[PDB]
Protein backbone atom coordinates (compact mmCIF):
# COMPACT_ATOMS: atom_id res chain seq x y z
CA UNK A 1 0.00 0.00 0.00
CA UNK A 2 1.00 3.64 -0.38
CA UNK A 3 0.08 4.03 3.32
CA UNK A 4 3.08 1.82 4.24
CA UNK A 5 5.75 4.31 3.14
CA UNK A 6 6.67 7.97 3.10
CA UNK A 7 6.40 9.66 -0.31
CA UNK A 8 9.45 9.73 -2.57
CA UNK A 9 10.95 12.99 -3.76
CA UNK A 10 10.30 12.87 -7.50
CA UNK A 11 12.59 15.72 -8.62
CA UNK A 12 15.20 17.68 -6.66
CA UNK A 13 14.88 21.48 -6.38
CA UNK A 14 18.07 21.91 -8.42
CA UNK A 15 16.76 19.48 -11.05
CA UNK A 16 13.53 21.44 -11.67
CA UNK A 17 13.14 22.98 -15.15
CA UNK A 18 13.57 26.71 -15.81
CA UNK A 19 10.49 28.94 -15.68
CA UNK A 20 11.45 30.77 -18.92
CA UNK A 21 9.75 28.91 -21.81
CA UNK A 22 11.42 28.02 -25.12
CA UNK A 23 12.04 31.08 -27.26
CA UNK A 24 9.32 32.00 -29.78
CA UNK A 25 10.07 35.74 -30.13
CA UNK A 26 12.80 38.33 -30.00
CA UNK A 27 12.34 39.58 -26.41
CA UNK A 28 11.32 37.99 -23.11
CA UNK A 29 8.41 39.81 -21.44
CA UNK A 30 9.09 40.00 -17.70
CA UNK A 31 5.38 40.55 -16.94
CA UNK A 32 3.76 37.80 -18.98
CA UNK A 33 6.66 35.27 -18.66
CA UNK A 34 6.38 34.78 -22.44
CA UNK A 35 8.22 35.90 -25.57
CA UNK A 36 7.21 39.06 -27.44
CA UNK A 37 8.12 40.50 -30.86
CA UNK A 38 7.09 37.73 -33.25
CA UNK A 39 5.45 34.34 -32.67
CA UNK A 40 7.06 31.39 -34.46
CA UNK A 41 7.79 27.82 -33.40
CA UNK A 42 5.55 25.47 -31.46
CA UNK A 43 4.98 25.88 -27.73
CA UNK A 44 4.23 22.18 -27.03
CA UNK A 45 7.07 19.95 -25.79
CA UNK A 46 7.35 16.44 -24.29
CA UNK A 47 7.37 16.33 -20.48
CA UNK A 48 10.79 15.38 -19.01
CA UNK A 49 8.86 13.83 -16.09
CA UNK A 50 6.31 11.04 -15.69
CA UNK A 51 4.44 9.60 -12.72
CA UNK A 52 5.32 6.07 -11.57
CA UNK A 53 2.41 5.28 -9.18
CA UNK A 54 3.74 2.21 -7.31
CA UNK A 55 7.17 3.82 -6.86
CA UNK A 56 6.32 7.44 -6.05
CA UNK A 57 3.11 7.16 -3.97
CA UNK A 58 3.31 7.61 -0.24
CA UNK A 59 2.26 9.49 2.85
CA UNK A 60 2.81 13.25 3.12
CA UNK A 61 1.96 16.13 5.47
CA UNK A 62 -1.39 16.30 3.69
CA UNK A 63 -2.48 12.93 5.08
CA UNK A 64 -1.71 14.24 8.57
CA UNK A 65 -3.25 17.69 7.94
CA UNK A 66 -6.55 16.15 6.82
CA UNK A 67 -5.99 17.41 3.25
CA UNK A 68 -8.54 16.76 0.51
CA UNK A 69 -6.72 17.75 -2.68
CA UNK A 70 -4.08 15.87 -4.64
CA UNK A 71 -0.70 17.23 -5.67
CA UNK A 72 -0.69 18.70 -9.19
CA UNK A 73 3.08 18.13 -9.53
CA UNK A 74 2.91 14.58 -8.18
CA UNK A 75 0.55 13.85 -11.10
CA UNK A 76 3.02 15.62 -13.41
CA UNK A 77 5.79 13.42 -11.87
CA UNK A 78 7.82 16.47 -10.79
CA UNK A 79 6.93 17.27 -7.15
CA UNK A 80 9.90 18.85 -5.35
CA UNK A 81 8.60 18.57 -1.74
CA UNK A 82 8.06 14.77 -1.56
CA UNK A 83 6.94 13.88 1.97
CA UNK A 84 6.91 17.53 3.15
CA UNK A 85 4.15 18.25 0.58
CA UNK A 86 0.87 19.72 1.83
CA UNK A 87 -1.00 17.81 -0.93
CA UNK A 88 -1.80 14.11 -1.31
CA UNK A 89 0.78 11.93 -3.14
CA UNK A 90 -1.27 8.93 -4.30
CA UNK A 91 -3.72 7.93 -7.03
CA UNK A 92 -7.29 8.92 -6.00
CA UNK A 93 -9.42 6.16 -4.48
CA UNK A 94 -13.03 5.75 -3.31
CA UNK A 95 -12.12 6.89 0.24
CA UNK A 96 -10.74 10.17 -1.09
CA UNK A 97 -13.56 10.53 -3.64
CA UNK A 98 -15.96 10.27 -0.68
CA UNK A 99 -13.97 12.94 1.17
CA UNK A 100 -14.08 15.15 -1.98
CA UNK A 101 -17.82 14.48 -2.68
CA UNK A 102 -18.98 17.95 -1.47
CA UNK A 103 -16.30 20.15 -3.16
CA UNK A 104 -16.21 18.03 -6.41
CA UNK A 105 -19.17 19.92 -7.99
CA UNK A 106 -17.19 23.17 -8.29
CA UNK A 107 -13.59 21.98 -7.76
CA UNK A 108 -11.06 19.72 -9.41
CA UNK A 109 -9.46 16.97 -7.32
CA UNK A 110 -6.40 19.28 -7.46
CA UNK A 111 -8.57 21.99 -5.83
CA UNK A 112 -8.69 24.18 -8.95
CA UNK A 113 -11.98 26.02 -9.57
CA UNK A 114 -14.09 24.80 -12.53
CA UNK A 115 -15.60 26.97 -15.28
CA UNK A 116 -19.06 27.54 -16.78
CA UNK A 117 -18.06 26.84 -20.40
CA UNK A 118 -15.35 24.52 -21.68
CA UNK A 119 -12.50 26.09 -23.61
CA UNK A 120 -12.99 25.98 -27.40
CA UNK A 121 -9.89 23.75 -27.32
CA UNK A 122 -11.73 21.34 -24.88
CA UNK A 123 -8.52 21.50 -22.75
CA UNK A 124 -8.23 22.84 -19.21
CA UNK A 125 -9.95 22.08 -15.91
CA UNK A 126 -13.52 21.42 -17.15
CA UNK A 127 -17.09 22.55 -16.58
CA UNK A 128 -19.15 22.49 -13.38
CA UNK A 129 -22.26 21.96 -15.59
CA UNK A 130 -21.25 18.68 -17.32
CA UNK A 131 -19.62 16.29 -14.69
CA UNK A 132 -17.58 14.65 -17.51
CA UNK A 133 -15.74 11.35 -16.86
CA UNK A 134 -14.20 10.87 -20.35
CA UNK A 135 -10.81 11.94 -21.75
CA UNK A 136 -9.95 12.45 -25.41
CA UNK A 137 -6.43 11.17 -26.15
CA UNK A 138 -4.91 12.90 -29.17
CA UNK A 139 -1.43 13.60 -30.46
CA UNK A 140 -0.71 9.86 -30.46
CA UNK A 141 1.60 10.08 -33.49
CA UNK A 142 3.78 12.67 -31.75
CA UNK A 143 3.66 10.64 -28.51
CA UNK A 144 5.29 7.80 -30.42
CA UNK A 145 7.83 10.07 -32.25
CA UNK A 146 5.95 9.18 -35.50
CA UNK A 147 6.86 5.48 -35.06
CA UNK A 148 4.61 3.22 -37.07
CA UNK A 149 2.51 1.04 -34.78
CA UNK A 150 -0.50 -1.21 -35.30
CA UNK A 151 -3.87 0.06 -33.91
CA UNK A 152 -4.33 -2.74 -31.36
CA UNK A 153 -0.73 -2.11 -30.21
CA UNK A 154 -1.57 1.59 -29.66
CA UNK A 155 -4.70 0.54 -27.76
CA UNK A 156 -2.63 -1.81 -25.57
CA UNK A 157 -0.25 1.07 -24.72
CA UNK A 158 -3.13 3.41 -23.84
CA UNK A 159 -4.70 0.58 -21.83
CA UNK A 160 -1.50 0.11 -19.82
CA UNK A 161 -0.72 3.73 -18.92
CA UNK A 162 -4.23 4.98 -18.10
CA UNK A 163 -5.16 1.89 -16.03
CA UNK A 164 -2.48 2.75 -13.48
CA UNK A 165 -4.32 6.00 -12.76
CA UNK A 166 -7.80 4.88 -11.74
CA UNK A 167 -10.74 2.56 -12.11
CA UNK A 168 -11.88 2.51 -15.74
CA UNK A 169 -15.28 2.15 -17.41
CA UNK A 170 -14.25 1.98 -21.10
CA UNK A 171 -11.29 2.39 -23.41
CA UNK A 172 -11.77 2.57 -27.18
CA UNK A 173 -9.31 3.44 -29.93
CA UNK A 174 -10.52 4.79 -33.28
CA UNK A 175 -8.13 4.02 -36.15
CA UNK A 176 -9.68 6.35 -38.77
CA UNK A 177 -9.50 9.37 -36.46
CA UNK A 178 -6.26 8.02 -34.79
CA UNK A 179 -7.49 8.94 -31.32
CA UNK A 180 -8.46 7.23 -28.08
CA UNK A 181 -11.25 7.70 -25.53
CA UNK A 182 -10.79 6.72 -21.86
CA UNK A 183 -13.78 6.82 -19.46
CA UNK A 184 -13.24 6.54 -15.68
CA UNK A 185 -15.45 5.32 -12.81
CA UNK A 186 -15.08 8.71 -11.01
CA UNK A 187 -14.59 12.23 -12.42
CA UNK A 188 -11.71 12.74 -9.90
CA UNK A 189 -9.69 10.02 -11.68
CA UNK A 190 -10.40 11.67 -15.07
CA UNK A 191 -9.23 15.03 -13.63
CA UNK A 192 -6.11 13.36 -12.18
CA UNK A 193 -5.22 11.23 -15.24
CA UNK A 194 -5.60 14.20 -17.60
CA UNK A 195 -2.82 16.10 -15.81
CA UNK A 196 -0.78 12.90 -15.26
CA UNK A 197 -0.80 11.96 -18.97
CA UNK A 198 -0.79 15.41 -20.64
CA UNK A 199 2.31 15.99 -22.83
CA UNK A 200 3.67 12.46 -22.16
CA UNK A 201 5.06 9.92 -24.57
CA UNK A 202 3.60 6.49 -25.19
CA UNK A 203 7.07 5.07 -25.94
CA UNK A 204 8.67 2.24 -23.95
CA UNK A 205 12.23 1.66 -22.74
CA UNK A 206 12.00 -1.38 -25.00
CA UNK A 207 11.52 0.84 -28.08
CA UNK A 208 14.33 1.78 -30.47
CA UNK A 209 13.13 5.42 -30.27
CA UNK A 210 13.46 5.77 -26.46
CA UNK A 211 16.74 7.76 -26.47
CA UNK A 212 15.14 10.61 -28.49
CA UNK A 213 11.69 10.61 -26.81
CA UNK A 214 12.06 14.29 -25.79
CA UNK A 215 12.21 15.69 -29.34
CA UNK A 216 8.58 16.01 -30.48
CA UNK A 217 5.24 16.87 -28.90
CA UNK A 218 3.66 14.53 -26.37
CA UNK A 219 0.14 13.26 -25.75
CA UNK A 220 -2.68 15.74 -26.11
CA UNK A 221 -5.18 14.79 -23.40
CA UNK A 222 -8.42 16.79 -23.34
CA UNK A 223 -12.03 16.47 -22.23
CA UNK A 224 -14.21 14.36 -24.55
CA UNK A 225 -17.33 15.66 -26.31
CA UNK A 226 -20.62 13.72 -26.06
CA UNK A 227 -20.45 10.39 -27.97
CA UNK A 228 -22.59 10.63 -31.15
CA UNK A 229 -22.94 6.79 -31.28
CA UNK A 230 -26.68 6.01 -30.79
CA UNK A 231 -25.84 2.93 -28.67
CA UNK A 232 -23.77 5.15 -26.36
CA UNK A 233 -26.55 7.75 -26.31
CA UNK A 234 -29.22 5.27 -25.23
CA UNK A 235 -26.76 3.84 -22.67
CA UNK A 236 -26.29 7.41 -21.37
CA UNK A 237 -30.09 7.82 -21.18
CA UNK A 238 -30.44 4.52 -19.29
CA UNK A 239 -27.85 5.51 -16.67
CA UNK A 240 -29.49 8.97 -16.41
CA UNK A 241 -32.84 7.30 -15.65
CA UNK A 242 -31.14 5.00 -13.11
CA UNK A 243 -29.44 7.98 -11.37
CA UNK A 244 -32.81 9.78 -11.27
CA UNK A 245 -34.61 6.77 -9.76
CA UNK A 246 -31.85 6.39 -7.15
CA UNK A 247 -32.21 10.09 -6.26
CA UNK A 248 -36.01 9.84 -5.84
CA UNK A 249 -35.33 7.51 -2.88
CA UNK A 250 -33.29 10.20 -1.11
CA UNK A 251 -35.79 13.01 -1.78
CA UNK A 252 -38.72 10.87 -0.59
CA UNK A 253 -36.96 9.62 2.55
CA UNK A 254 -35.90 13.19 3.45
CA UNK A 255 -39.41 14.62 2.92
Site residues, RNA (CB under 7 A): 40, 42-44, 121-123, 134, 136, 138-142, 170, 172, 174, 176-179, 181, 183, 217, 220, 222-230, 232
Q: Which is nearer to RNA, 101 or 240 (CB)?
A: 240
**Separation CA 243–CA 233 (nearest Å):** 15
**Separation CA 65–CA 99 (nearest Å):** 14
The item of RNA, Zn ion, none sharing an interface with residue 74, based on CB under 5 to 8 Å by kind, is Zn ion
* H-only helix segments in the chain: 53-56, 61-64, 72-75, 94-100, 140-143, 151-163, 187-197, 230-254
In the complex, the smallest distance separating the C-beta of residue 146 from RNA, rounded to whole angstroms, is 9
CB within 8 A of 252, min separation 6: which ones?
A: none
In the complex, the smallest distance separating the C-beta of residue 2 from RNA, rounded to whole angstroms, is 30
* Other Cβ atoms within 10 Å of 17 Cβ, number: 12
Of 74, 77, 75, 96, the residue nearest 195 (C-alpha): 75
Q: Is 202 in the site for Zn ion (CB under 5 A)?
A: no
The alpha carbon of residue 43 and the mean position of all alpha carbons in its chain are separated, in whole angstroms, by 19
The item of Zn ion, RNA, none sharing an interface with residue 232, based on CB under 5 to 8 Å by kind, is RNA
Q: Is 71 in the site for Zn ion (CB under 5 A)?
A: yes
Kindly write out the interface string for residues 23-42 of this chain, putting x where it contacts Zn ion by CB under 5 A and - elsewhere: --------------------
Of 63, 218, 66, the residue nearest 137 (C-alpha): 218
In the complex, the smallest distance separating the C-beta of residue 72 from Zn ion, rounded to whole angstroms, is 8
In the complex, the smallest distance separating the C-beta of residue 7 from Zn ion, rounded to whole angstroms, is 7
The item of Zn ion, RNA, none sharing an interface with residue 183, based on CB under 5 to 8 Å by kind, is RNA
Name the residues that contact Zn ion, by CB under 5 A: 71, 74, 79, 85, 87
Amino acid sequence: SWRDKSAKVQVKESELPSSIPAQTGLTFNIWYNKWSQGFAGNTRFVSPFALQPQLHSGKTRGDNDGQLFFCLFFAKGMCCLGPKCEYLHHIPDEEDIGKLALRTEVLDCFGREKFADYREDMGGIGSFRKKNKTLYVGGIDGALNSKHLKPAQIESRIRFVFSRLGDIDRIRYVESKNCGFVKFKYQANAEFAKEAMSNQTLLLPSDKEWDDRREGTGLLVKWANEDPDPAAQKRLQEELKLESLNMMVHLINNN
